[PDB]
Amino acid sequence: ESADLRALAKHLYDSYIKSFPLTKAKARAILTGDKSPFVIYDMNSLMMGEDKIKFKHITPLQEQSKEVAIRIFQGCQFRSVEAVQEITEYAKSIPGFVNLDLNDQVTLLKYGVHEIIYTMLASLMNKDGVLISEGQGFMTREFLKSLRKPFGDFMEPKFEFAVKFNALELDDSDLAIFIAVIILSGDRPGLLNVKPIEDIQDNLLQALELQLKLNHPESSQLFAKLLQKMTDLRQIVTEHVQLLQVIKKTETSLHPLLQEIY
Amino acid sequence: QLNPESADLRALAKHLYDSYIKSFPLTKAKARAILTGKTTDKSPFVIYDMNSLMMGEDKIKFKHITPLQEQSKEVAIRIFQGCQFRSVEAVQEITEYAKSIPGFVNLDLNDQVTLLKYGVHEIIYTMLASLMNKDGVLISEGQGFMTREFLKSLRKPFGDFMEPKFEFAVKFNALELDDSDLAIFIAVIILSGDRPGLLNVKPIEDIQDNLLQALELQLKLNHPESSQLFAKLLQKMTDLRQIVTEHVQLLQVIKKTETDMSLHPLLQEIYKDL
Ligand SMILES: CCCCCCCCc1ccc2n1[B-](F)(F)[N+]1=C(CCCCC(=O)O)C=CC1=C2
Ligand SMILES: CCCCCCCCc1ccc2n1[B-](F)(F)[N+]1=C(CCCCC(=O)O)C=CC1=C2
């Protein structure tokens, strides 16, 4: 299967490039240095970001959008909903995924997206900030903590995680297989037929292993260090879910249909 | 076949296995022999109720579990106290096992303490697995056995500390690991690096890297028929964080309902800021 593990690597990688717009390599050239991004570092660079970046897709809903930080978080959610559809599409590219019990595919997706969103979010951030709206922007890190209430402490966890994660220096070729592994997680609650999901992940894990040893001769035991990060992820996700609690001690095209889209 | 390279990782394995046997009285091997029946002299006294909870104190040695403290209006707490002194003892053994891990004592004394502070519990529940089956857990060096049901019926809060452990033990035992594997695994666990506040991550990492290499070689050599057990084992480390956190997130609650119950000092310096 030495060749059968490359076939799978190349294939996943192709679906990855086709399902995701902004890639690792991509977002990396931007973060480090033609068309520089618009940096959001304070209140005015944001108010100015609204129109300029036109990312406003998430804003136009007049009457609700009137308090900063609610509008940023609201934007964290619109792009998230977007990404879920991209993740879902990538899933179907994973050999055997489509052939599983439909309830399980939904279940795998229901619990795998949050882990996949943070993994990729790392591709878009550095110790100093995160790339937003397709790459047209860069919302600084300090500004994010500059948000108040539980808001100014929800992005700082992910920055800490991203820093450790990106240190592994993984590329799109690598992440593609990693993303799939997370999806084919046989321990998600409510699964009806775990065997098939495990066979697939294992077949995926072999390919990831071969992928990491060929692409990073230099880094000993990278396979192991990467699998360990799945721990940081679960904490990051459980933590995140807690943040969604207090944010209820906050509020709660008219909103009555927005709430239902999320 | 076998080259300079591997040969070194194999000696590390034999080295840790040997320290592990030397550090923990009740190994998985002994524990399995007790639970399965290859014995007429190792059979445990079963506790599934007060009737036998009472009987137990008689046949199987205690009052080293039940420290200076007569009884207590209810059993749920007396057990708890036991699992407390036993746990602190495990920390002790785990601590002597750590020292044997090559390079571990050569690190900054503060780092050493950090690895133990977070490693101790993940290691306790890993080993605690060895003493369990879907139906219960061995106690008192193997002399007793407390049913999974007795434990889940205990008083409202206390009858809730052990189920998650059983939940993990069953999944984890399905890996069918043995003492020689666990020794290397428990070793990787201590030598994390991503532990909070570590003053010097590099050396810690260079060590784990080697242990991971030893574990990878051990697993394939020991479970050739078990594909990706290496990765499957690493993924298990997340169930541990969750067991740990859940426990701590259960400990605090008792620190209010029971203003009269006590925590071992040590045991507090572990959970502090956990
Ligand atoms: C190929 C790209 C992979 C997709 C990455 C995952 C979704 C984006 C996301 C999640 C959290 C978060 N970000 B956030 F939502 F993007 N976000 C923002 C601002 C959002 C701007 C709109 C955008 O990026 O599309 C601020 C913190 C934060 C934090
Ligand atoms: C690295 C070493 C770790 C291996 C496992 C040793 C720790 C055992 C432990 C921890 C919690 C717990 N158990 B427990 F303590 F084993 N426990 C009991 C048994 C009480 C026995 C009382 C006696 O010793 O006489 C009941 C719940 C519980 C719950």
- Residue B66 CB partners (closer than 8 Å, separation 6+): B57, B78, B81, B82
Q: Please, are residues B251 and A225 in contact by the beta-carbon 8 Å criterion?
A: no
Experimental determination technique? X-ray
Our answer on whether the CB atom of A233 is closer than 6 Å to any ligand 1 atom is no
Distance separating alpha carbons of residues B83 and B190, to the nearest angstrom: 22
List the residue whose alpha carbon is closest to atom 7 of ligand 2. B87
DSSP letter string, A223-245: HHHHHHHHHHHHHHHHHHHHHHH
Q: What share of chain B is helix, strand, coil (3-state, %, to 5)?
A: 65, 5, 30
CB spacing of B209 vs A228 below 8 angstroms: no
- Taking the centre of ligand 2 as the mean of its atom positions, its distance from the CA of residue A63, in whole angstroms, is 58
Q: Which residues pair with B46 in a beta bridge?
A: B145
Which DSSP letter does residue A152 get? G
Residue of A227, A231, A232 lying closest to B231 (CB–CB): A227
Residue A205 burial (10 A CB sphere; 0-12, 13-18, 19+): buried
- Residue B79 CB partners (closer than 8 Å, separation 6+): B146, B151, B154, B158
- At position A107, the amino acid (one-letter code) is T
- Residue B119 CB partners (closer than 8 Å, separation 6+): B94, B98, B189, B190, B192, B195
CB spacing of B237 vs A231 below 8 angstroms: yes
CA dihedral B196, B200, B201, B207 (to 10 degrees): -120
Backbone φ/ψ region at B141: left (φ over 0), alpha (ψ -120 to 50), beta:
left
C-alpha distances in Å from residue B127, one per residue of B91, B121, B124, B179, B183? 12, 10, 5, 9, 10
- Residue A32 CB partners (closer than 8 Å, separation 6+): none
In terms of residues, how long is chain B? 274
Split into its structural domains, chain A has a count of 1
- At position B101, the amino acid (one-letter code) is I
Ligand nearest to the CA of B92: 2
Q: Please, are residues A243 and A154 in contact by the beta-carbon 8 Å criterion?
A: yes
Closest CA to B130 of B235, B35, B270: B35
Distance separating alpha carbons of residues B112 and B103, to the nearest angstrom: 10
Q: Is A170 helix (H, G, I), strand (E, B) or coil?
A: coil
Our answer on whether the CB atom of B140 is closer than 6 Å to any ligand 2 atom is yes
CB spacing of B228 vs A202 below 8 angstroms: yes
The two three-digit tokens of residue A241, written as one number: 């879910």
Distance separating alpha carbons of residues A236 and A121, to the nearest angstrom: 12
The two three-digit tokens of residue B36, written as one number: 């399965």
C-alpha distances in Å from residue B163, one per residue of A137, B48, B128, B148, B166? 48, 15, 13, 8, 5
Distance separating alpha carbons of residues A134 and B49, to the nearest angstrom: 63
Our answer on whether the CB atom of A46 is closer than 6 Å to any ligand 1 atom is no
CA of residue A61 relative to chain centroid, distance = 25
Probe site for chain B from A161, A209, A221, A229 (most B CB atoms < 10 A): A221
| CATH code of B73's domain | 1.10.565.10
Residue of B194, B209, B238 lying closest to A220 (CB–CB): B209
Distance separating alpha carbons of residues B113 and A216, to the nearest angstrom: 33
- Residue A83 CB partners (closer than 8 Å, separation 6+): A113, A117, A120
Main-chain dihedrals φ then ψ at residue A137, nearest 5 degrees: -135, 180
- Taking the centre of ligand 1 as the mean of its atom positions, its distance from the CA of residue A101, in whole angstroms, is 31
- How many Cβ atoms from other residues are within 10 Å of residue A154's Cβ? 21
Q: Please, are residues A34 and A116 in contact by the beta-carbon 8 Å criterion?
A: no
Backbone φ/ψ region at B39: left (φ over 0), alpha (ψ -120 to 50), beta:
beta
DSSP letter string, B140-151: GGGTEEEEHHHH
Give the structural domain span for B151: 1-274
Q: Please, are residues A196 and A100 in contact by the beta-carbon 8 Å criterion?
A: yes
Distance separating alpha carbons of residues B145 and B168, to the nearest angstrom: 18
Q: Please, are residues A37 and A137 in contact by the beta-carbon 8 Å criterion?
A: yes
C-alpha distances in Å from residue B195, one per residue of A252, A258, B118, B234? 37, 41, 7, 16
Distance separating alpha carbons of residues B125 and B127, to the nearest angstrom: 5
Closest CA to B122 of B212, B208, B238: B238
Distance separating alpha carbons of residues A9 and A197, to the nearest angstrom: 18
Pairing of β B132-133 and β B45-47: unpaired
Distance separating alpha carbons of residues A90 and A177, to the nearest angstrom: 11
Our answer on whether the CB atom of B26 is closer than 6 Å to any ligand 2 atom is no
How close, in Å, is residue B203 to chain A by CA atoms? Answer: 15
Distance separating alpha carbons of residues A102 and A108, to the nearest angstrom: 10
The two three-digit tokens of residue B143, written as one number: 């002399």
Crossing angle of helices B179-190 and B28-36, rounded to 10°: 130
- At position B77, the amino acid (one-letter code) is I
Matching residue, tokens 């594909």: B227
